[PDB]
Amino acid sequence: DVCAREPIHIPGLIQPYGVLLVIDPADGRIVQASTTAADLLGVPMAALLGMPYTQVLTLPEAQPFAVDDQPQHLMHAEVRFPQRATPPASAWVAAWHLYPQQWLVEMEPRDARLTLREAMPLLRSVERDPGIAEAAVRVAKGLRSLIGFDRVMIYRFDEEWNGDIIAEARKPELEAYLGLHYPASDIPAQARALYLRNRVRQIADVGYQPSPIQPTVHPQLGTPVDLSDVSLRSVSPVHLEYLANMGVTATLVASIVVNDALWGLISCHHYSPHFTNHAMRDVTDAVARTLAGRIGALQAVARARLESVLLTVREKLITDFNDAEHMTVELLDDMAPDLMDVVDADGVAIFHGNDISRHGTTPDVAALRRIRDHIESEHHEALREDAVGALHVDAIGEVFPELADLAPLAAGFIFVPLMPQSRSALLWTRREQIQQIKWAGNPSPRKSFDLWQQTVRGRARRWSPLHLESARSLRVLIELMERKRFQQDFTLLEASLSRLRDGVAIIERGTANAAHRLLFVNTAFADVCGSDVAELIGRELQTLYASDAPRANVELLQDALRNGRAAYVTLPLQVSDGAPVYRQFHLEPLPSPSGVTAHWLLQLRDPE
């Protein structure tokens, strides 16, 4: 928090190995310059300030130019210093950063002796490597041989922005850092952000003399120099403290940017001073690029493969579960392996009112009932809201402290449906996975990096979002269960109704513009009318009584229908053939949650 609040991009200091000048794109005048400029360029800080760059420039290659909006970056090219008699003992090379209001020229030694063509057999290998692990180690081993670093490691960022050394290539005599876990605070967010912008950075000598930009703020713009893109940018004195405490004298780290996000870093350490020249710096850029590219592709194909297997298994469960009308014991015992696999659970428990069907490695029925009871609690009603489609825990003891135990079999779980009481419910469980976090430290930078193995009990393997959506996708199985149950009970009650002696009908109350329709009619009611049951459903009630029926008796029926009340009247029926069939109409209003009657029960006593 207070660590992440540090400029780091505007230190007003550079590394002493190179020289930096700030040029005004209108005049070509040097507005700001680092103290290291005076010694190489010839002219001291006095006249060097406010001087046209061309008088101290000898660039045989490309030249700087005006930029409209998007800045342009020119590569390291030969630079010579005319206002001095052979100032360097080594070849010098200058890079340009051209922004609309300022130009920045950074120059550093060429160095020579070591390159892109020799990196190609390595790049070509990782491009066709299977799995991130294989590529990561190939890159560390390969890069360690290409540049000459004492140790090269691939630092993968995890979900909480912590880090893990997943690959390492080092001098045999060195203590291995492989598999060591570092907190998220070691690389604060403001640094991580810059590591997407500036993808390769070097520290030639940890604890150097930082060379400051003479006018710290722009003499006419009043702004500090945004050294985000300058490779010479002086690094944090907190990181330089950490690096000295770790015993490293030189650094070179390149970002692994997968899908426009910092996936990890290629961290190189040298326990002696080491300047990585523009050439080696470009080679490490190419390997980081290729490694980020392969990781992404492998991750993309993986997801794509997993999603299609997980779909088949889901679609089989939806079909198999629909096809069977009565949910037998062998049905669920066949379903169980695929019902666990879809979400990658260690066990599953199917609930249907007091009954529980447990499969795989799950707690006992008493505990599965203890877990379900606890979730549907009034106390845990906020959890079900804040949950997305299914409630899930990675560590039962944290979320549900009263279910602290049960962690060995149901440490993690996916509970569906989010609706309380419900009758039908699915509970996927993952058992405890004792995790061993290999800290290189413990919880201003740390002096010691001693191994500290934190043993974490009561947690299960994290539910991947692929497995959480696979769960949400199977909510349809809960509604399948409920529908089929109400369907079974409804047809039973309809069968009992359709075979009654007394002739009954369920009337749906109309509206002002709608009329009262027959919703249900039994064979005894339909036969007294003449028409078959199917033809009479949806027929208006006003149809059933003869278009002759007395005013008084009809108005009594209409008054109850109008007011949603009850009626008992003898009315003649609309005769299909002849004989006047009078029946006594017993209209009774069926209860409504609002008390405002929505349906009636019409029954016509069968004479006996």
Ligand X SMILES: *C(=C)C1=C(C)C(=O)N/C1=C\C1=NC(=C\c2[nH]c(/C=C3\NC(=O)C(C=C)=C3C)c(C)c2CCC(=O)O)/C(CCC(=O)O)=C1C
Helices and strands (H, E) in the chain, number of each type: 18, 25
**Which residue, 244 or 568, is less far from a second copy as judged by CB?**
568
Least separation in angstroms between residue 35's CB and ligand X is: 20
Candidate residues 158, 364, 489, 527; the one interacting with a second copy per rule CB under 8 A: 489
- The least CB distance from residue 470 to a second copy, in Å, is 11
Q: Is 529 among the annotated ligand-binding positions?
A: no
Q: Which is nearer to a second copy, 68 or 260 (CB)?
A: 260
For residue 117, state whether it binds a second copy (rule: CB under 8 A). Answer: yes
Render the burial of 230-253: b for 16+ CB within 10 Å, e for the rest: bbbbbbbeebbbbbeebebbbbbb
Strand order in the sheet with 347-352: 355-360, 347-352, 424-430, 412-416, 391-393
Residue partners of 446: CB distance under 8 A and separation at least 6: 242, 245
Measure CA of the first residue to CA of the last residue in the chain; give whole Å: 89
Q: Which sign does the torsion angle of CA 240, 244, 247, 249 carry?
A: positive
- Could you say which of a second copy, ligand X, none residue 290 binds, taking C-beta under 5 to 8 angstroms by partner kind? a second copy
Q: Which does 582 bind (CB under 5 to 8 A by kind): a second copy, ligand X, none?
A: none
Residue 353 zone, left/alpha/beta (φ > 0; ψ -120 to 50; rest): left
Rounded to whole angstroms, the Cα distance separating 351 from 372 reads: 9
The set of residues, in sequence order, having a beta carbon less than 8 Å from that of 343 and lying 6+ positions away, is 414, 428, 463, 467, 470, 471, 474
In this structure, which amino acid lies at residue 585? F
* Choice between 447 and 499, CB closer to ligand X: 447
Min separation Cβ 267 and ligand X, Å: 4
| Per CB under 8 A, 564 contacts a second copy | no
Q: Is 251 in the site for ligand X (CB under 6 A)?
A: yes
In single-letter form, the type of residue at position 316 comes to K
Please work out the total of residues on this chain that contact ligand X, with binding judged by CB under 6 A. Answer: 23
- Confirm or reject binding of residue 338 to a second copy (CB under 8 A): no
* DSSP, residue by residue, 206-263: SS---EEBSSSB-TTT--B--TTS-TTBPPPHHHHHHHHHTT-SEEEEEEEEETTEEE
Q: Rounded distance, CA 14 to CA 213, Å? A: 7
Locate tokens 């150097």: which residue?
A: 208
The answer to the question of residue 445 lying near ligand X (CB under 6 A) is yes
As beta bridge partners, residue 358 has 349
Nearest Cα to Cα of residue 518 among 487, 544, 551, 485: 544
Q: Is 468 in the site for ligand X (CB under 6 A)?
A: no
159 binds a second copy (CB under 8 A): no
Q: Which stretch binds ligand X (CB under 6 A): 215-223, 233-241, 474-482, 512-520?
A: 233-241
What, of a second copy, ligand X, none, does residue 300 touch, CB below 5 to 8 Å by kind? a second copy
Stretch that binds ligand X, among 18-26, 262-270, 393-401, 490-498 (CB under 6 A): 262-270
Among 20, 143, 191, 573, binds ligand X (CB under 6 A): 191
Q: Site residues for ligand X, window 200-219 (CB under 6 A)?
A: 201, 203
Minimum distance from CB of 13 to a second copy (Å)?
Answer: 26
Among 46, 47, 114, 116, binds a second copy (CB under 8 A): 116
Strands of the sheet with 599-604, listed across from one edge: 517-521, 504-508, 599-604, 582-590, 567-572
Q: Which of 168, 186, 346, 432 is close enough to bind ligand X by CB under 6 A?
A: 186
* Residue 137 binding partner per list a second copy, ligand X, none, with a CB distance cut-off of 5 to 8 Å that depends on partner kind: none
Q: Print the binding letters for residues 399-438 with a second copy: x by CB under 8 A, - otherwise.
A: -------------------xx-------------------
In angstroms, give the least distance from the CB of 566 to a second copy. 10
CA distance 523 to 357: 41
Q: Is the dihedral of CA 453, 459, 460, 466 positive or negative?
A: negative
Q: Does 182 bind ligand X (CB under 6 A)?
A: yes
Neighbours of 86 (CB within 10 A): 7
Does 75 help bind a second copy (rule: CB under 8 A)?
Answer: yes
**Alpha carbon distances (Å) from 33 to 145, 322, 435, 488:** 37, 76, 53, 86
Judge if the upstream peptide bond of residue 363 is cis by omega within 30 degrees of 0: no
User: Distance between CA atoms of 226 and 240, rounded to whole angstroms?
Assistant: 20
Q: How far is the CB of 143 from ligand X (least distance, A)?
A: 14
Helix orientation angle between 329-341 and 278-323, rounded to the nearest 10 degrees: 170
Does 236 bind ligand X (CB under 6 A)? Our answer is yes
253 makes contact, choosing from a second copy, ligand X, none, with CB < 5 to 8 Å by partner type, with ligand X
Interface with a second copy by CB under 8 A: which range of 145-153, 398-406, 454-462, 499-507? 499-507
In the bound state with ligand X, the residue whose beta carbon lies nearer, of 155 and 525, is 155
CA nearest to 12, candidates 41, 40, 42, 32: 32
Q: Which of 443, 440, 5, 9 is nearest to 189 (CA)?
A: 5
Binding of ligand X by 184 (CB under 6 A): no
Q: Which does 75 bind (CB under 5 to 8 A by kind): ligand X, a second copy, none?
A: a second copy
Closest approach of Cβ 13 to ligand X, in Å?
Answer: 11
Tell me how many residues contact a second copy (CB under 8 A).
77
Q: Which of 447, 483, 562, 565 binds a second copy (CB under 8 A)?
A: 483
Distance in angstroms (rounded) separating the CA atoms of residues 569 and 557: 7
Please pick, from the candidates 66, 91, 309, 492, the single residue that binds a second copy as defined by CB under 8 A: 492
Rounded to a whole number of angstroms, the minimum distance from the CB of residue 295 to ligand X is: 18
What is the nearest approach in angstroms of a second copy to the Cβ of residue 521? 11
Check residue 46 for interaction with a second copy (CB under 8 A).
no
Closest CA to 165 of 138, 188, 148, 140: 140
118/158 with CB nearer a second copy: 118
* Identity of the residue, 4 or 466, whose beta carbon is nearer to ligand X in the bound complex: 4
List the binding residues for biliverdin IXalpha: 3
Binding residue positions: 3
Task: Kindly list the residues in this chain that would bind ligand X in the complex (CB under 6 A).
Answer: 3, 6, 8, 177, 182, 185-188, 191, 201, 203, 235-236, 238-239, 242, 251, 253, 265, 267, 269, 445
